[PDB]
Amino acid sequence: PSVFLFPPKPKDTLMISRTPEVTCVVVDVSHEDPQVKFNWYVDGVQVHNAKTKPREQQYNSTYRVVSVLTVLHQNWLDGKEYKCKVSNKALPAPIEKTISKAKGQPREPQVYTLPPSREEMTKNQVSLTCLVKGFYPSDIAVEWESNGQPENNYKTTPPVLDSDGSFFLYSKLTVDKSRWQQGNVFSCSVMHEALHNHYTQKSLSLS
Amino acid sequence: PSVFLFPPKPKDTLMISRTPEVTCVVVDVSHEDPQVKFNWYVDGVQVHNAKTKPREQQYNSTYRVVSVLTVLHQNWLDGKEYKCKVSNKALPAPIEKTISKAKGQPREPQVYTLPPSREEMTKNQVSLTCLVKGFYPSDIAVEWESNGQPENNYKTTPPVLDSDGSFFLYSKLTVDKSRWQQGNVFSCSVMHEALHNHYTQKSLSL
């Protein structure tokens, strides 16, 4: 019986409208003893339930049980810890997993736009770069938009630990060289705990 | 037990100056169940001690008998399959792990250097950027230099899969806004299998 804890997505805890959740997954719950008991703790409190919500399923030759705990944006942002306790009769002792945002003071991310290299504008498509550095924790979200709509041909590198101990990454948007020249303006939106309304934005054009 | 094979460092297979090596790491070997044996096979051949060399342990309460094999840059680059065959008493059966380089037509990388952003010109330090895309496989080594001398304060994002099945990454050198003001010239070095002479170098400056 294995147990994996999953944290909410970066955007979920940054937007009051979204719904952030902590998910507890248990794989390899034998066919014989499919009983699984979940106990949830938020800073060690709640052996007595909470929102909670399990379901039940069947796979290869084992069982999979998922429990979902909705969390409060500020509880997560305030570093609270979430414990999932999985008890199974076919287990020597209960298995406990715990997760939260990384410990450390939140640093504001610096977002810069970077136009393509002269030596690339000789190809049908160029690269519009968006540098995001000095942020912490690593939880973060990046997106691109040219006009009132998303650009879907871009990639973001995963965050990287700088010498600072803060985090940095690069998102690369790929545009038809023809567009970038038509004077079009693009922008990457970065969402982080340390940004004003959990959001800043930077423009990039050909002027 | 628990075996894990590791491929050589990209930079090692691209320059004969260095020696590539397939490192076989076995964890959690018991005190009462030591005596760890090895066996390396390159494309089937070699069942008897090849040119290996393993030793050293001690951990959290376990072992870890790490074996090491010397690789031939050509052998690896051509895709020969390296097979580590561990054998232990406290192990139900003979575990195994193989590995060869990522298969597929290699693709030379494009290297572009970028100036720091106008907006970043407000800090006591700036960011010299190096973009690298269109390369396959992902094994790649990126370094920075200034008039012959090495740069230490730089970080490189790992290889990321782009839409076309090729990879790209970014390297970032942190330098004093002054050095960039003085007009110094920095260079981005890229080592890859598909580059002529396994090496290309791009420059940037004010």
Ligand SMILES: *[C@@H]1O[C@H](CO[C@H]2O[C@@H](C)[C@@H](O)[C@@H](O)[C@@H]2O)[C@@H](O[C@@H]2O[C@H](CO)[C@@H](O[C@@H]3O[C@H](CO[C@H]4O[C@H](CO)[C@@H](O)[C@H](O)[C@@H]4O[C@@H]4O[C@H](CO)[C@@H](O)[C@H](O)[C@H]4NC(C)=O)[C@@H](O)[C@H](O[C@H]4O[C@H](CO)[C@@H](O)[C@H](O)[C@@H]4O[C@@H]4O[C@H](CO)[C@@H](O)[C@H](O)[C@H]4NC(C)=O)[C@@H]3O)[C@H](O)[C@H]2NC(C)=O)[C@H](O)[C@H]1NC(C)=O
């Ligand atoms: C019997 O069947 C079961 C189901 O199999 C399914 O597969 C298909 C092919 C078919 O066979 C059918 O049977 C089923 O459809 C098998 O269950 C599997 O069991 C293994 C355990 O051996 C699980 O492996 C773990 O996977 C997680 C990641 O899982 C996420 O992503 C998967 C896609 O890649 C996806 O399939 C998963 O469902 C899950 O998705 C997430 O789900 C949540 C909830 O819905 C969502 O909110 C997310 O959005 C969603 N994400 C995405 C993307 O979709 C992985 O994290 C685990 O790795 C960690 O742990 C390893 C130790 O075991 C360790 O080696 C790793 O390095 C890694 O370590 C972690 O490192 C991080 C930092 O990076 C630390 O923070 C962690 O602390 C640390 N972990 C710890 C605590 O050690 C691991 O690989 C597998 O997910 C599961 N399959 C599914 C699906 O449930 C079963 O194995 C099989 N055989 C038997 C009998 O076992």
Ligand SMILES: *[C@@H]1O[C@H](CO[C@H]2O[C@@H](C)[C@@H](O)[C@@H](O)[C@@H]2O)[C@@H](O[C@@H]2O[C@H](CO)[C@@H](O[C@@H]3O[C@H](CO[C@H]4O[C@H](CO)[C@@H](O)[C@H](O)[C@@H]4O[C@@H]4O[C@H](CO)[C@@H](O)[C@H](O)[C@H]4NC(C)=O)[C@@H](O)[C@H](O[C@H]4O[C@H](CO)[C@@H](O)[C@H](O)[C@@H]4O[C@H]4O[C@H](CO)[C@@H](O)[C@H](O)[C@H]4NC(C)=O)[C@@H]3O)[C@H](O)[C@H]2NC(C)=O)[C@H](O)[C@H]1NC(C)=O
């Ligand atoms: C007792 O201590 C031991 C060591 O623990 C450490 O932390 C504390 C406990 C300390 O007290 C101290 O003991 C020690 O510092 C524990 O052993 C540990 O066991 C785990 C699980 O087996 C190991 O994790 C695996 O790590 C692999 C990567 O190893 C490299 O990277 C790590 C960190 O990144 C580094 O520490 C290692 O040294 C190693 O680094 C490489 O070393 C080479 C030689 O030195 C060198 O040439 C390389 O350049 C260097 N590279 C780096 C990283 O720099 C992962 O590969 C493993 O993941 C695979 O396997 C798991 C299954 O276990 C999969 O779930 C996972 O997905 C992945 O493989 C799958 O997915 C890939 C991706 O798609 C796919 O290709 C595969 O086909 C697929 N197959 C598999 C296998 O599933 C693990 O994470 C851990 O490293 C090891 N400890 C160390 C540091 O060696 C004991 O557990 C502990 N107590 C116990 C329980 O006994």
